[PDB]
């Protein structure tokens, strides 16, 4: 069945316990979250941009993480389901290198996750998020936007940054599940991939992309 298309190459070699949340979830230790979250800056600390927008390092829990465009990733490096965001959340499963779905839990060395993304409406999704084998959240998408501006607090925008550039909307710059610097798409594995969002509030929202209406739940802070 289609659960067999989940790459399940998981190895808790760092002794964190992270595989528990794939089952008996609700045990997260949020003590280190304030230190991790202090590395994320509110949008107001970035420089205003202007001029024509063109297309362009870690901590994927910050909204302003600037990802690389999605490609094809070996299934041996993935643990659990891959979610991509249209912005509505969709699951991408294992295939062979030619795109035929495969049903061996990603254990075959030819198995891959073809995440190659082109922004909707002409494409498939804005970005993707998954967990790698040792429990680190990985994300890809966009590519994010260079909005101009001067100084060392210049913003590569991977979400809706309207306040810093009028044209840097999510349709233009979205690169993953961050709808705005304060909101990310809610989905069954959000708490596993983004555990420090545990206390975010859940809002019913609507987004329009090329005139297609998306009704989704957003988790906001």
């Amino acid at each position, epitope marked *: 069945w289609h659960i067999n298309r989940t790459a399940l190459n998981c190895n808790d070699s760092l002794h964190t*316990g992270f595989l528990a949340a794939l089952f008996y979830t609700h045990k997260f230790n949020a003590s280190g979250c304030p230190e991790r979250m202090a590395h994320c800056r509110p949008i107001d600390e970035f420089a205003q941009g202007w001029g024509p927008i063109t297309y362009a390092d870690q901590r994927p829990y910050c909204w302003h993480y600037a990802p690389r465009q999605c490609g094809t990733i070996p299934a041996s490096q993935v643990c659990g389901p891959v979610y991509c965001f249209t912005p509505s959340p969709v699951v991408v499963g294992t295939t062979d290198r030619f795109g035929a779905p495969t049903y061996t*839990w990603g254990e075959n060395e030819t198995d891959v996750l073809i995440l190659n993304n082109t922004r909707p409406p002409q494409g498939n999704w804005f970005g993707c998020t998954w967990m790698n084998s040792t429990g680190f959240t990985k994300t890809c998408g966009g590519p994010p936007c260079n909005i101009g501006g001067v100084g060392n607090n210049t913003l590569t925008c991977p979400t809706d940054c309207f306040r810093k550039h009028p044209e840097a909307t999510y349709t233009k710059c979205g690169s993953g599940p961050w709808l705005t610097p304060r909101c990310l798409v809610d989905y069954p594995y959000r708490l596993w991939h983004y555990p420090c969002t545990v206390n975010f509030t859940i809002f019913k929202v609507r987004m329009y992309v090329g005139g297609v209406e998306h009704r989704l739940n957003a988790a906001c802070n």
Partner: antibody
Amino acid sequence: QVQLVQSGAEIQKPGASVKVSCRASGYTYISTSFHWVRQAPGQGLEWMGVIKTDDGSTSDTQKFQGRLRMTWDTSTSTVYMELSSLRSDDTAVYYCVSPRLGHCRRGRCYETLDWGQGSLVTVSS
Amino acid sequence: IVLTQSPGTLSLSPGERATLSCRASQSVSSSYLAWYQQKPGQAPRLLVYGASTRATGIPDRFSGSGSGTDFTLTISRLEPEDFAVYYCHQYSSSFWTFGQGTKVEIKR
């Protein structure tokens, strides 16, 4: 990085009680089961009981009925083992043990075991 | 579930291969058979879990195999630090039980 930190060595008279503690540390997701196993000088390993932190549910062996009491303090992530009416042959190193998922392969995941460093309890007059 | 280890004492030289057996009275899933090393005065050190999965940090020369009622721990090339007591351990049934130990000593 998971480390189970037990309390230090203890000496008690026969008939008394001892309370051994085991503090969970370094977890990102805290395990739900803690077992106690003991090893007397020069002997093998013997399972005593288990506490489930979710329920407070405890299961023990009938060799220690009435004397063994296991509790969980959720605010300090510390499990306690209390053994009452001590006899000299309760002299042993007492270990807390907590299973944890180590890896997955072909749709099924497999538990490994994190061990505390042991607590020596010596019972003597 | 009684676990019976054999032999009680293995007298080998460094570089030789060691093979330790564990036999259970009833059947246990591979899923829940662990092997430990224990040195005098120290705590048991986990070597393999799930019968055949080496714990992280454990050198490659240690490997576990078997299923059902019969399980094996192999050290391919004994090193000086490997002479110790070894225990098997079934944890499939919440009432855990352990083997009685195999001592691996130096032959001379």
